[PDB]
Design a protein around this ligand. Sequence first.
Ligand SMILES: N#CC[C@H](C1CCCC1)n1cc(-c2ncnc3[nH]ccc23)cn1
Length: 287
Amino acid sequence: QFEERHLKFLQQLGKGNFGSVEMCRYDPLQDNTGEVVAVKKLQHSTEEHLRDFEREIEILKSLQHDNIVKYKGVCYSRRNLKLIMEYLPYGSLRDYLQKHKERIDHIKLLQYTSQICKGMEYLGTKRYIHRDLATRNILVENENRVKIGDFGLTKVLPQDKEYYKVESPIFWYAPESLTESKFSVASDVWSFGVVLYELFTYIEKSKSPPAEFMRMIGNDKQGQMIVFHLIELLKNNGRLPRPDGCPDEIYMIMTECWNNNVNQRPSFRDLALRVDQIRDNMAGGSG
Ligand SMILES: N#CC[C@H](C1CCCC1)n1cc(-c2ncnc3[nH]ccc23)cn1
């Protein structure tokens, strides 16, 4: 779809563990008048990583939703597969919320929450598991609209099961992901609860899930024993605390998402409805 020669690098936007995203100018008219785009490429183009990247591209191209970053096309010349997507200039929600927190009230946080929920509801209709729902993977287009911005870990559920068994962001993981490496819509709901916690702490680093969990566990632990003591903590119903200023009903949603019983966690459809109702009530539909 895109031609390598016209694409001009401008600046790096983000770097993951296997890919990076660049800000580039696509200029088919060679007049520098072309659109600025975001370009994802692999750091190391091994056979494994390229096969994974191809499926990620297929996943994004199949998604069309207001709250999912827009696929544009692919670009290659010989092993230089790149994914072209719409550029969102406010960057990740983490940076945005940090910079603008004093101006972002709870009604606005719930607007972002609702948009994330509806994007995930849409993902569920395709039987996709995101596996990395966290504010680092949410992008901001404008002050009224966020989009799920990265799908590098997203899996398609197999046809015989409602879960996929597969360096992990352990402080966002459901207990069965930690113990059984099992990922499902329900483990995405668990991670969504952590996202809600991130939003209502305004991405303060001292209150981040890793900082909170390590204080609860003990900083003497490293690597494997961190995971062990996190599992024991969650099994014993230890949970992240209610953020300062967070309404109790919003914390209650977090804690329902963090149920150890997978079957007890809410659906994204129900989360979107409840968040929308809370937001409307807070804005003056109930006071
Ligand atoms: N979301 C998310 C995180 C993702 C990083 C995580 C792995 C590659 C980079 N990332 C995407 C961007 C980005 N920024 C601005 N516009 C964009 N469009 C598509 C991705 C994108 C920046 N970092």
